[PDB]
Amino acid sequence: AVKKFKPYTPSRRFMTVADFSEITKTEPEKSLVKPLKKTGGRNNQGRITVRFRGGGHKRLYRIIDFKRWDKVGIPAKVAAIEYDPNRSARIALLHYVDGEKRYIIAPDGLQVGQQVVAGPDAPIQVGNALPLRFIPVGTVVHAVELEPKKGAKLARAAGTSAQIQGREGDYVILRLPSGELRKVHGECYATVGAVGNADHKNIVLGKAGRSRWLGRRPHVRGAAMNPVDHPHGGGEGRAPRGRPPASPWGWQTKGLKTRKRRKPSSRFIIA
Amino acid sequence: MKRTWQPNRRKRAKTHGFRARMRTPGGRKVLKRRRQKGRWRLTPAVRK
RNA sequence: CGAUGUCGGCUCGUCGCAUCCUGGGGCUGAAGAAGGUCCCAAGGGUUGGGCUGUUCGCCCAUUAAAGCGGCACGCGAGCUG
RNA sequence: GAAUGCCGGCAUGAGUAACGAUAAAGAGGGUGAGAAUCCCUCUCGCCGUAAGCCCAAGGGUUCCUACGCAAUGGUCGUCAGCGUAGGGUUAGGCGGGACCUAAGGUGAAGCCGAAAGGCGUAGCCGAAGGGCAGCCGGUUAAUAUUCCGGCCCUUCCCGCAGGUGCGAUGGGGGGACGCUCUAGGCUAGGGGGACCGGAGCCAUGGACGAGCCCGGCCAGAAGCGCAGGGUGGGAGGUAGGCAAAUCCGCCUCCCAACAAGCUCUGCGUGGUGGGGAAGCCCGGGUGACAACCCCCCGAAGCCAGGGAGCCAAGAAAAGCCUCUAAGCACAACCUGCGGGAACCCGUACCGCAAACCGACACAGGUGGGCGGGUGCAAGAGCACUCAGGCGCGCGGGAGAACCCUCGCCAAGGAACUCUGCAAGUUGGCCCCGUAACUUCGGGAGAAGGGGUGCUCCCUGGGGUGAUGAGCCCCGGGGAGCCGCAGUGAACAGGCUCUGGCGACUGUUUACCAAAAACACAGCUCUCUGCGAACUCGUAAGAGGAGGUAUAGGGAGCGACGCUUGCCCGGUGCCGGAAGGUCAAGGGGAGGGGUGCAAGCCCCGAACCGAAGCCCCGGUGAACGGCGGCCGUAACUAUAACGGUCCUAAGGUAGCGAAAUUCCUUGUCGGGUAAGUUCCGACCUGCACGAAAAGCGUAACGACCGGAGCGCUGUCUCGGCGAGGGACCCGGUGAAAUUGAACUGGCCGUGAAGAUGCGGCCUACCCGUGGCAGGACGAAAAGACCCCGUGGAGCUUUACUGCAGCC
RNA sequence: GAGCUAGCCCUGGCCAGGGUGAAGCUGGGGUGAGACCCAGUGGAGGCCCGAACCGGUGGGGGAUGCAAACCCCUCGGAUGA
RNA sequence: UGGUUCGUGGAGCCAUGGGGGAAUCUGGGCGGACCACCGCCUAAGGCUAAGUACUCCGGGUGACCGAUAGCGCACCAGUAC
RNA sequence: UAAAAAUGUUCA
RNA sequence: CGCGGGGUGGAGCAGCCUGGUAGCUCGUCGGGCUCAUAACCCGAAGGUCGUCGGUUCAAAUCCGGCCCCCGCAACCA
RNA sequence: CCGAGGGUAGGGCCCGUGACUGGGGCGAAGUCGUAACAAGGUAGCUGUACCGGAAGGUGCGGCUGGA
RNA sequence: GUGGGAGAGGGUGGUGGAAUUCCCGGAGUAGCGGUGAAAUGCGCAGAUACCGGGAGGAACGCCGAUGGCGAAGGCAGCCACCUGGUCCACCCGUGACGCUGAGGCGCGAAAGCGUGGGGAGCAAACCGGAUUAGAUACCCGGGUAGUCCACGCCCUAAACG
Numbered sequence A: 001a002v003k004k005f006k007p008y009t010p011s012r013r014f015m016t017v018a019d020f021s022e023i024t025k026t027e028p029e030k031s032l033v034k035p036l037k038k039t040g041g042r043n044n045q046g047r048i049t050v051r052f053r054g055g056g057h058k059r060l061y062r063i064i065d066f067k068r069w070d071k072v073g074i075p076a077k078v079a080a081i082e083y084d085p086n087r088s089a090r091i092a093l094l095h096y097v098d099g100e101k102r103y104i105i106a107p108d109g110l111q112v113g114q115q116v117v118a119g120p121d122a123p124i125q126v127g128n129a130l131p132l133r134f135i136p137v138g139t140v141v142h143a144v145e146l147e148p149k150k151g152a153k154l155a156r157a158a159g160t161s162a163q164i165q166g167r168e169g170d171y172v173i174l175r176l177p178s179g180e181l182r183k184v185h186g187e188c189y190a191t192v193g194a195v196g197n198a199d200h201k202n203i204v205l206g207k208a209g210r211s212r213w214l215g216r217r218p219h220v221r222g223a224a225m226n227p228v229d230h231p232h233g234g235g236e237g238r239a240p241r242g243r244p245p246a247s248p249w250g251w252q253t254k255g256l257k258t259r260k261r262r263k264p265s266s267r268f269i270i271a
Numbered sequence B: 001m002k003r004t005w006q007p008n009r010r011k012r013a014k015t016h017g018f019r020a021r022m023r024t025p026g027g028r029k030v031l032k033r034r035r036q037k038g039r040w041r042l043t044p045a046v047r048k
Numbered sequence C: 001c002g003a004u005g006u007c008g009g010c011u012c013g014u015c016g017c018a019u020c021c022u023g024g025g026g027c028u029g030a031a032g033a034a035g036g037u038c039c040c041a042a043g044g045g046u047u048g049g050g051c052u053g054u055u056c057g058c059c060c061a062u063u064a065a066a067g068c069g070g071c072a073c074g075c076g077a078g079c080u081g
Numbered sequence D: 001g002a003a004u005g006c007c008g009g010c011a012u013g014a015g016u017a018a019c020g021a022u023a024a025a026g027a028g029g030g031u032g033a034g035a036a037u038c039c040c041u042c043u044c045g046c047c048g049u050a051a052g053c054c055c056a057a058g059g060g061u062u063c064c065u066a067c068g069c070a071a072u073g074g075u076c077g078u079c080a081g082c083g084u085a086g087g088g089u090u091a092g093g094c095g096g097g098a099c100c101u102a103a104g105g106u107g108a109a110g111c112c113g114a115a116a117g118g119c120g121u122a123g124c125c126g127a128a129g130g131g132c133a134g135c136c137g138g139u140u141a142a143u144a145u146u147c148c149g150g151c152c153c154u155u156c157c158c159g160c161a162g163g164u165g166c167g168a169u170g171g172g173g174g175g176a177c178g179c180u181c182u183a184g185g186c187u188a189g190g191g192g193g194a195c196c197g198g199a200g201c202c203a204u205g206g207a208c209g210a211g212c213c214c215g216g217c218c219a220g221a222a223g224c225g226c227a228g229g230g231u232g233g234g235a236g237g238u239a240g241g242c243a244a245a246u247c248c249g250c251c252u253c254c255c256a257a258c259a260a261g262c263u264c265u266g267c268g269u270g271g272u273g274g275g276g277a278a279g280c281c282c283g284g285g286u287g288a289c290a291a292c293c294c295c296c297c298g299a300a301g302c303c304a305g306g307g308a309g310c311c312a313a314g315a316a317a318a319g320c321c322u323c324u325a326a327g328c329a330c331a332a333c334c335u336g337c338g339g340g341a342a343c344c345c346g347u348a349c350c351g352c353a354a355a356c357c358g359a360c361a362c363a364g365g366u367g368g369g370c371g372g373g374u375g376c377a378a379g380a381g382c383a384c385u386c387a388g389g390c391g392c393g394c395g396g397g398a399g400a401a402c403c404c405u406c407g408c409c410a411a412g413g414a415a416c417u418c419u420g421c422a423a424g425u426u427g428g429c430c431c432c433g434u435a436a437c438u439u440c441g442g443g444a445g446a447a448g449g450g451g452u453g454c455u456c457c458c459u460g461g462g463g464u465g466a467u468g469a470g471c472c473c474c475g476g477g478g479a480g481c482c483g484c485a486g487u488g489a490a491c492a493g494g495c496u497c498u499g500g501c502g503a504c505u506g507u508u509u510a511c512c513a514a515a516a517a518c519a520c521a522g523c524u525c526u527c528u529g530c531g532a533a534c535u536c537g538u539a540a541g542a543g544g545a546g547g548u549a550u551a552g553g554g555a556g557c558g559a560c561g562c563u564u565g566c567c568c569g570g571u572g573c574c575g576g577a578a579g580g581u582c583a584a585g586g587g588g589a590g591g592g593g594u595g596c597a598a599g600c601c602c603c604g605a606a607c608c609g610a611a612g613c614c615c616c617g618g619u620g621a622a623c624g625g626c627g628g629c630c631g632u633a634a635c636u637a638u639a640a641c642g643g644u645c646c647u648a649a650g651g652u653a654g655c656g657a658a659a660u661u662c663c664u665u666g667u668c669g670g671g672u673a674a675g676u677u678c679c680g681a682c683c684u685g686c687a688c689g690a691a692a693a694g695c696g697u698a699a700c701g702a703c704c705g706g707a708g709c710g711c712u713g714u715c716u717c718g719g720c721g722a723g724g725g726a727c728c729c730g731g732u733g734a735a736a737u738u739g740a741a742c743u744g745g746c747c748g749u750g751a752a753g754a755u756g757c758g759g760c761c762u763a764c765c766c767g768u769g770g771c772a773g774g775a776c777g778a779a780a781a782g783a784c785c786c787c788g789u790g791g792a793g794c795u796u797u798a799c800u801g802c803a804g805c806c
Numbered sequence E: 001g002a003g004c005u006a007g008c009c010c011u012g013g014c015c016a017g018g019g020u021g022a023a024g025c026u027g028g029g030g031u032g033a034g035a036c037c038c039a040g041u042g043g044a045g046g047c048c049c050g051a052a053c054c055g056g057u058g059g060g061g062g063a064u065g066c067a068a069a070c071c072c073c074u075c076g077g078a079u080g081a
Numbered sequence F: 001u002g003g004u005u006c007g008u009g010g011a012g013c014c015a016u017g018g019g020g021g022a023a024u025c026u027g028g029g030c031g032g033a034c035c036a037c038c039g040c041c042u043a044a045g046g047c048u049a050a051g052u053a054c055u056c057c058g059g060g061u062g063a064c065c066g067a068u069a070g071c072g073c074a075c076c077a078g079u080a081c
Numbered sequence G: 001u002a003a004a005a006a007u008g009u010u011c012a
Numbered sequence H: 001c002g003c004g005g006g007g008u009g010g011a012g013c014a015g016c017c018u019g020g021u022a023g024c025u026c027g028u029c030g031g032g033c034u035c036a037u038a039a040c041c042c043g044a045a046g047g048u049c050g051u052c053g054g055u056u057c058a059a060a061u062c063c064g065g066c067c068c069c070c071g072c073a074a075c076c077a
Numbered sequence I: 001c002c003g004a005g006g007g008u009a010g011g012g013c014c015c016g017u018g019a020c021u022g023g024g025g026c027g028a029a030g031u032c033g034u035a036a037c038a039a040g041g042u043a044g045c046u047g048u049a050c051c052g053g054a055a056g057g058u059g060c061g062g063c064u065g066g067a
Numbered sequence J: 001g002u003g004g005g006a007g008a009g010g011g012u013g014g015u016g017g018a019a020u021u022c023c024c025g026g027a028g029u030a031g032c033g034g035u036g037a038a039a040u041g042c043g044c045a046g047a048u049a050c051c052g053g054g055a056g057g058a059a060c061g062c063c064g065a066u067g068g069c070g071a072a073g074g075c076a077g078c079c080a081c082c083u084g085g086u087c088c089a090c091c092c093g094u095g096a097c098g099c100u101g102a103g104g105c106g107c108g109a110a111a112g113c114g115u116g117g118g119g120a121g122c123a124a125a126c127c128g129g130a131u132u133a134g135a136u137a138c139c140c141g142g143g144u145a146g147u148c149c150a151c152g153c154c155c156u157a158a159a160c161g
């Protein structure tokens, strides 16, 4: 829905915030081996290796189950649906019947008190996670593994989803949320349905700060940076790049295709 | 106004310490000049 | 050039005469009153504003008149900047 | 003798500048060889969210005491943070270590690197974080929750008695936690009292007066009250806690639930211990066997992991409970009571400062805690002031110019000036009352006003009490009094109209620039399918991300509104399994050197040969680019229309002498007495123009421009006055500079602006206060300019490489 | 050499008192149900005044300084990038 | 690619990252491309004094200094600062 | 579902 | 002052570089189609190549001198 | 105490005027095309939308006031 | 009220095939395309034509009618769910409870606007090819908004019988 705010202060007239209904009932995270200390600094060993990171709300990590194929066929009651500050998406707290509880990325429509389960056995309904090969062609699914047994790595952003286009051999073919068209192993597991909280794309940070809250430091164009600093830098007072667009490292930044030509992954893709 | 030297005894031993020098191969190679030169202090004097 | 700090303003001036004013004077196509031109004469005077950083100008209101130049385009170990 | 040479010494300026914040001093006693400067006393002024107390860091004996003053003290010194000597820092419960983990460091394994070395698992190290047992008084010249007195705790080991399956570095629980706003009880703290306890006091007209003055506490186990925090009990099953568990987690069900009980803190009380003014008499006595009570205010602290709302969603490990495993149940833990045992390190003193950082007893810098009273609405603000600490280490006089800091000014009133720069007016609270414009929030504290003291009477609410007196806390209504004046002192905006640029809060050139610059939400392009792209690294590895296209990186543009046109010829990037070209390599026609030869050697043509370039197309919020000349309408003018040339296409919308207009103070219009600035227009726009965005835009702005009103020394035009210097006396006593000097004017001459040459004219010798024209005055071997086949940083379709990528 | 300065990481601390008055609630009105409009309560805010504190805007002093960036007056922000 | 005087040069020899890859003396390497004679020597394991270098230390000389010289230190200097 | 085709001064 | 571009029928442009030959489009003139006008069709005329010389046998063309045209530059203190 | 009016300040209604600018009416024989009235030589008109010297053109839907 | 009937009335979810375009695979050649005629364009880097396989969007042929429903705008594959209006018979029930309707409220083709998505075909603007004295038109080859969906606006029309 996104809340809006009355213009009683600018920066806060364009501001909007998440609809927080779908969550409630649980906001304190499930301590039980669920949070971890989350280490959190911009660079690597010494040097900053991603410009413009830092500051921004102290934040805790929810370890979430990304490969549901452990507790196979074990069913599980969804306890609630909460907020995870390490993702755009919502995560739901489920309780399996083992007693064992795990976090999982919470697809659209998933409502508290649902039974839900993983395996091939499983029925094609939201929140249930099957090996793609067992999933009915042209249904929407999410949190797809890529190479099987290597976990979920596709479709996990707020309101994204891959759809199936049909099989061919051991591989099924999915349109990823980018639109690309990847042959994917049927043995890859994937929980059905769209990731929801898709009103995300709709929110407006509004002020300079807010951004900071998420620890995104201010950013500076190449211009206004001296020539030593950057391609675009220099010139007596505001000047049209210079020809042509470049990263402060030297590479064309409009257009110049980047992936490895000779990569093996090529020949599974098509889009 | 806040000047350059702002003493801190922990920072002094940690930085120009002895165990401090001996780590780095450059630091060992300090002691050498120092000791060969006949300094009375191979290390900044700062007590606890 | 092992440096004589540059425009304009302000302060303080001083000197020249090819005198703007006042004082003399000869012509006049000088009736009178006004003027025109030239000669002698700086002794002393030679205003206040609007515009522009301006010197310079162009305006407003006056005035006997509202002179023109030199002094490292006088004057920053006096000020401004 | 010369190198702005090197070292040392000593001169000059100079008995000059200055003696480090304009908080301030005076006198009488002492001590002494001598003291405005040391000791004492009485006045006076200054600080008091302090220039006052308590810590932390740093310093490191500076602390105390006895002797001293040569030098250190910008003067003096009989003083000292100074010299000499001697004393002085006492803990099982405070802080740190024989406890824990954070970032990070190290690092058995393991991986990597010519070497030196670099990563890195477990582990260990690592703290103003978690954990953990002391409160109050007394003593010393100097130490103490460290000695002592009282009251109260903590662990270990051992012994005795009574209870229980005890038992791990392993399992689970717990520790455990954001921001903002608040509930109720207390406590710290504070204000009163006609009460209690006290030496004294009526002093100058009056008052023995419920008068004045001073003080009416602190700690304290068990037990008990009063506030709260934590908390459902069951019985079965169990595919989870890498199940070893009756523990946790899951289900299923007799009970119970804006509770009760158990339990843990806070506060009150408490056996009892301790403290106990003013004043007066020499730190001690006395004030005493002191009094040690009642009411009111009341926290930013305590009960606290309490509650509510919000999103950007908020440490870890140990101690601490609990569960079982090996093992052991003569073990062993658990609960009482006893005895014993309890180490190492810091305890001085300075601590917003003369004992720390600034070479100096440097008007600078320095984290945490307490920070009293009264009044001004409140408050850590302001004025005075407790306690407590200060008068800042050179003084005494004189009162000129001039300088600083400050007060007042007739008439005018920005006439000053680059600019009202500076200063002034305004200025708190309460109540009226407020426009265009607007994204409806704003613009507003718009503007423009009125009130603002004290006295008496009447009257409305609340908190504490008991609904009733006090005690505070918010009011409303009448009359009256005094002044030039009532936030009568101090701290508290000048206002408006209209342009430019940037939306806005924010950021920046530490030491000349805070802005129209950077950033900013938002907009678009582009890359990246995830051992992602990209970055760092020789690599291992790490960041990206314990993320995954509603995700990440790069680029530009910059809220929002309305929009963002045409050309891909060229450069770039994207797409083209045909072609041309192309390097090794394949291939070997054919040639050559040698040997008597088998042979061994050389070169070597077609042809087959990648990327790259060529070629073909695509692509502008990719780099970029978006013309000329001549003619034409029934007045003249102009040119809807036409002709022709060139281009890849030839600037559209919207702006326009504009932060862009040279000619230009373009030409009209407005404002003014007068306006090269400003505002509004026109528009041969020398050189606007659409995301290096275009045109607008409410609100914002220590931004830049124009105009009013109000008020003023800014000015006409100056004047008077205050203090701090300047001057005089005493004390201490520098500096740059300096070829030597017995260092006048003019007219000249001279390397072309002479004190030093010529002629002439003036001119007794020496200082003090002033002024600054000259000594081409000082200062920096000119920053500008040129030169040096001098040097750097930067750029690119300069050359040659290299990393990287193909 | 990051014991100054710039950034980031872990862990603590600090921000008097005022002034506006968002959403949510609660009540009343409205409608077929609504949207919605009124009061009261409520404390939102890179909100406002204003210390502390963080800055350093304009002017004056200072310029062998108290100081190798200081002092006076004035001024920006001050629950937030 | 390096080494040697050898900076591709007629460039061998000695090393050796990459590719191919023998034989044991009718076996192999060299004598500066390359063959033919004629000679030299024996690869792909290792050790080995002496003559050579330096002098922190001791000794002896000095057409060496004699305290702004001689070592930075003739002196409690690699100190004070 | 039809080919290429503009124009005609004023007043009666 | 500098550097470089251009004056060619009435209008706009070609022709000059490697001298002999001036071409395209429009206009203009005659003639057609129509009833007329345009349009269209058939025909033709029209140029001192800015100018003053000199090179050549020959110059729009190659060479210097001016006259107008148009652009670029004019900087540092 | 009211109190005519005067002064200060900020509003609202109206009239006149203003460089410049928008479109309109009207004025015998100016210029450019000819959109419309006969399938007016692309049937016409229409609401909207963009574009163009100009009538106008085209897209989308509609009418018939055409076939 | 009772009992029956016809209908593209509306909203929602699901679904079927034809055709167009593109991708892949196969086969096969030199032209395809388009027009009044041409050219632009496309194609021997292997197009057009034919076969197979896949994606995607929009619209729904035959029935379909001079038909039906709706208050209007408007409504046409098929299925199901939710839901409006309407006609008939039986003459049973209430007792004039009625008609109209300034305001108000609601709906309202197309184009257009906002936020997301989607994009096969078509197609304002725009480019090119022609046609013409000029063509910023008509015809041709391309082509972006838009056309489509959700939600929120606009709310006009020869919204005409």
Ligand SMILES: NC[C@@H]1O[C@H](O[C@H]2[C@@H](O)[C@H](O[C@@H]3[C@@H](O)[C@H](N)C[C@H](N)[C@H]3O[C@H]3O[C@H](CO)[C@@H](O)[C@H](O)[C@H]3N)O[C@@H]2CO)[C@H](N)[C@@H](O)[C@@H]1O
Pocket: I026, I027, I030
């Ligand atoms: N009044 C009519 C409206 O205005 C215009 O009409 C005005 C003009 O267009 C029109 O001008 C015409 C012109 O159209 C036509 N082709 C040629 C004619 N000579 C002109 O005539 C006009 O000008 C001349 C003087 O030159 C006058 O004498 C004459 O009266 C006048 N009508 O004359 C009108 C002025 O009188 C619109 N064209 C018309 O469509 C519109 O409805």
Ligand SMILES: [Mg+2]
Pocket: none
């Ligand atoms: Mg490191």
Ligand SMILES: [Mg+2]
Pocket: A219, A220, A221
């Ligand atoms: Mg930026």
Ligand SMILES: [Mg+2]
Pocket: A224, A225, A226
């Ligand atoms: Mg710059």
Ligand SMILES: [Mg+2]
Pocket: A231, A232, A242, A243, A244, A246
């Ligand atoms: Mg570049």
Ligand SMILES: [Mg+2]
Pocket: A227, A228, A230, A231
């Ligand atoms: Mg560069």
Ligand SMILES: [Mg+2]
Pocket: A236, A237, A238
């Ligand atoms: Mg520029």
Ligand SMILES: [Mg+2]
Pocket: A231, A232, A233, A234, A235, A239, A240, A241, A242, A243
């Ligand atoms: Mg550039």
Ligand SMILES: [Mg+2]
Pocket: B008, B009, B010, B011
């Ligand atoms: Mg320390």
Ligand SMILES: [Mg+2]
Pocket: C001, C003
């Ligand atoms: Mg010079």
Ligand SMILES: [Mg+2]
Pocket: none
């Ligand atoms: Mg000199």
Ligand SMILES: [Mg+2]
Pocket: none
């Ligand atoms: Mg004369």
Ligand SMILES: [Mg+2]
Pocket: none
């Ligand atoms: Mg001026």
Ligand SMILES: [Mg+2]
Pocket: none
């Ligand atoms: Mg003069």
Ligand SMILES: [Mg+2]
Pocket: C073
């Ligand atoms: Mg001068």
Ligand SMILES: [Mg+2]
Pocket: C076
């Ligand atoms: Mg000066």
